[PDB]
Amino acid sequence: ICVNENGGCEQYCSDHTGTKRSCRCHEGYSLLADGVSCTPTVEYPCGKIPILEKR
Amino acid sequence: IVGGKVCPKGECPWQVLLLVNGAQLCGGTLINTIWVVSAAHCFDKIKNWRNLIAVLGEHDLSEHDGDEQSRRVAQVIIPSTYVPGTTNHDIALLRLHQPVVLTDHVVPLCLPERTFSERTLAFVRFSLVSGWGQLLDRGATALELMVLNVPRLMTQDCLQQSRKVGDSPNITEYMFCAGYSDGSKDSCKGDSGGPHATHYRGTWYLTGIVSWGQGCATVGHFGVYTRVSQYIEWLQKLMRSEPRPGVLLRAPFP
Ligand SMILES: CCOc1cc([C@@H](Nc2ccc3c(N)nccc3c2)C(=O)NCc2ccccc2S(=O)(=O)C(C)C)ccc1OC(C)C
Ligand SMILES: [Ca+2]
Numbered sequence: 152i153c154v155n156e157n158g159g160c161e162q163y164c165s166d167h168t169g170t171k172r173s174c175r176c177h178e179g180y181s182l183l184a185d186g187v188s189c190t191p192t193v194e195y196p197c198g199k200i201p202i203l204e205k206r
Numbered sequence: 207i208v209g210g211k212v213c214p215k216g217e218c219p220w221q222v223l224l225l226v227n228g229a230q231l232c233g234g235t236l237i238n239t240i241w242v243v244s245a246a247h248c249f250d251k252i253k254n255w256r257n258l259i260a261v262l263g264e265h266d267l268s269e270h271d272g273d274e275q276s277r278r279v280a281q282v283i284i285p286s287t288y289v290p291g292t293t294n295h296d297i298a299l300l301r302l303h304q305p306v307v308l309t310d311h312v313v314p315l316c317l318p319e320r321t322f323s324e325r326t327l328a329f330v331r332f333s334l335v336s337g338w339g340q341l342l343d344r345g346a347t348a349l350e351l352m353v354l355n356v357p358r359l360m361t362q363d364c365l366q367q368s369r370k371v372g373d374s375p376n377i378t379e380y381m382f383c384a385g386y387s388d389g390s391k392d393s394c395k396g397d398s399g400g401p402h403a404t405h406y407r408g409t410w411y412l413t414g415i416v417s418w419g420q421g422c423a424t425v426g427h428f429g430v431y432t433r434v435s436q437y438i439e440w441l442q443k444l445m446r447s448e449p450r451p452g453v454l455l456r457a458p459f460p
Contacts, residue, residue, distance in 0.1 A: 157326045161407045163319050177316050177409075189409075195308035197238070198316035198409035202216040205310075 161189045207337055208423035209391035210354030215265040218336045218351055220315035220401060223261040226252060230347065233337040233400030235412055236262055237317045239305035241445055244298045244399035245415050245432060246288040255453035258282070260302060263311040267338060267349045273311040278303040283444055285459030293375040295459060296417040296432045299444055315403055318411040323435035326406060327413050331357050333384065333404045335416060339396025343422035347396045354391055359383040359428060369426025380436050382414060383428040392423035402431045
């Protein structure tokens with residue numbers, strides 16, 4: 152599943168027991184209930200440009 | 207950077223400027239508050255290891271605006287497989303003496319997981335390369351941070367689209383080509399160690415390090431970047447390790 156289109160994950164993808172898939176996030180982020188999206192948990196998460204984000 | 211543009215202040219907030227005795231040495235990428243990823247070749251001629259400074263929040267080299275944060279480089283970790291004066295395994299992991307403070311102008315770039323980097327990031331065509339390097343081949347270096355968007359190439363295509371040269375190094379699985387063969391756009395020597403940053407679903411990730419090439423934006427030649435995805439586990443294991451006495455550390459690779 153992870154092999155194709157990142158298994159639908161916004162960030163990291165882990166394959167499981169055949170048809171199972173888990174999305175994960177980098178630290179400073181938490182996974183939303185959709186099970187794919189990552190939302191920042193900190194003021195300055197990695198890979199995001201504050202001047203652009205606050206615009 | 208040849209044929210790019212000024213990176214607007216705060217738009218490359220992970221960009222690092224490495225200094226030795228106050229002079230421009232290389233670039234680098236901030237990956238969290240204490241760690242910087244750069245190129246191993248930046249340290250080939252270093253004799254005074256105690257005068258290595260990393261500057262975060264830097265933009266314009268002619269003026270101090272108050273967003274700059276300087277830190278001494280406490281440790282430079284290079285893979286055992288890297289040989290000085292050669293091209294393969296061109297990566298260095300730098301431990302800052304004190305953490306930097308994250309602000310609107312100082313933000314780490316995500317060091318991605320290997321699988322995500324190989325399966326997804328390696329297929330994003332364009333990525334940004336940045337630094338205060340040469341604005342032209344045999345030209346002056348930039349006073350303001352420059353950024354360039356470059357397309358990534360499969361190694362077979364890079365070798366097929368390049369002009370053949372004698373004693374030119376092989377492109378290993380620890381490298382990748384990116385850029386243009388028309389001589390208009392490239393990263394150059396003064397940009398060495400700097401980030402090759404890839405955007406994916408609203409977030410930027412570290413995919414490459416400015417490593418080597420021919421001349422500077424030379425017709426028939428692409429930029430060669432260290433393939434960071436080969437080093438994820440190596441980097442992660444070292445970031446969990448206790449500091450060791452002495453600046454330079456050679457660590458087993460793999
Ligand atoms: C593994 C690194 O090998 C090389 C690095 C470079 C320079 N860097 C770059 C980087 C990106 C480039 C690009 N995209 N397009 C065109 C040219 C480019 C040149 C460089 O840093 N020169 C200076 C240098 C070179 C080697 C050790 C210390 C130094 S240094 O001490 O000056 C240090 C301050 C960088 C040139 C040739 C190299 O190898 C040959 C065998 C092909
Ligand atoms: Ca400045």
